[PDB]
Design a protein around this motif. Structure first.
Motif, PDB file in Angstrom:
ATOM      1  N   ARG A  73       0.815  -1.220   0.000  1.00 10.31           N
ATOM      2  CA  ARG A  73       0.000   0.000   0.000  1.00 10.31           C
ATOM      3  C   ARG A  73       0.849   1.271   0.000  1.00 10.31           C
ATOM      4  NH1 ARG A  73      -4.306  -0.213   4.761  1.00 10.31           N
ATOM      5  NH2 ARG A  73      -4.746   1.849   3.868  1.00 10.31           N
ATOM      6  N   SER A  74       1.369   1.636  -1.175  1.00  6.93           N
ATOM      7  CA  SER A  74       1.152   2.966  -1.736  1.00  6.93           C
ATOM      8  C   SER A  74       1.349   2.927  -3.246  1.00  6.93           C
ATOM      9  CB  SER A  74       2.103   3.997  -1.118  1.00  6.93           C
ATOM     10  OG  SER A  74       3.456   3.638  -1.337  1.00  6.93           O
ATOM     11  N   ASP A  75       0.364   2.383  -3.973  1.00  8.49           N
ATOM     12  CA  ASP A  75      -0.017   2.638  -5.367  1.00  8.49           C
ATOM     13  C   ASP A  75       1.075   2.979  -6.385  1.00  8.49           C
ATOM     14  OD1 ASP A  75      -2.688   2.039  -5.120  1.00  8.49           O
ATOM     15  OD2 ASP A  75      -3.302   4.095  -4.657  1.00  8.49           O
ATOM     16  N   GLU A  76       2.323   2.547  -6.180  1.00  5.70           N
ATOM     17  CA  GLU A  76       3.434   3.071  -6.984  1.00  5.70           C
ATOM     18  C   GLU A  76       4.593   2.082  -7.016  1.00  5.70           C
ATOM     19  OE1 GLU A  76       4.542   6.834  -5.335  1.00  5.70           O
ATOM     20  OE2 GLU A  76       3.183   8.032  -6.575  1.00  5.70           O
ATOM     21  N   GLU A  77       4.752   1.400  -8.156  1.00  8.40           N
ATOM     22  CA  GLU A  77       6.033   1.018  -8.772  1.00  8.40           C
ATOM     23  C   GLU A  77       7.016   0.354  -7.801  1.00  8.40           C
ATOM     24  OE1 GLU A  77       7.976   4.148 -10.860  1.00  8.40           O
ATOM     25  OE2 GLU A  77       7.049   3.665 -12.790  1.00  8.40           O
TER      26      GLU A  77
END
Length: 147
Positions: free
Chosen positions: A25-29
């Motif tokens: 969980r934080s939406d990024e790569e």
């Protein structure tokens, strides 16, 4: 470990490595771990391997100590494996080891009740056999464990 025991350990500054399931969980790569062939591994083997490496490590220089943890690991191991201990007894031991302001007055259950019972058993065995038996010695050893 129970949820209350884990909450007590986390309030004391301990983090249990072995359950490091950060649920992405934080939406990024998240790049840099695509080199393991997980698709050709059994789930039961990973489930058996994850339990066997459960280690509790500390992250802060709080008021808990190497000697108390070194004793307490074997005390908990002897409580669960050596005797038929319960999770409430684990919580009572952790409260008596970490929080002296909370009066957990004799909540260890079966062992404290078993302190006089094996002595009475040994009394009957002496009175009916006249041969030395370590039942009184086992009761005294577990009483010293309670001490």
């Amino acid at each position: 470990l129970s949820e209350l025991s884990r909450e007590i350990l986390k309030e004391n500054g301990f983090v249990i490595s072995g359950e490091n399931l950060k649920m992405d969980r934080s939406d990024e790569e998240f790049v840099g771990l695509a080199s393991f062939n997980v698709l050709r591994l059994d789930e039961e083997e990973m489930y058996e391997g994850l339990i066997k490496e459960m280690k509790i490590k500390r992250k802060k220089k709080g008021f808990l100590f190497p000697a108390n943890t070194l004793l307490l690991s074997e005390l908990i191991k002897f409580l669960i494996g050596g005797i038929k201990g319960t999770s409430f007894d684990i919580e009572t031991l952790l409260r008596n080891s970490f929080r002296p302001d909370i009066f957990s007055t004799d909540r260890l259950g079966r062992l404290s009740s078993s302190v006089p019972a094996l002595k009475v058993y040994a009394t009957v065995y002496m009175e009916y056999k006249n041969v030395n038996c370590p039942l009184n010695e086992i009761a005294d050893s577990l009483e010293g464990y309670l001490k």
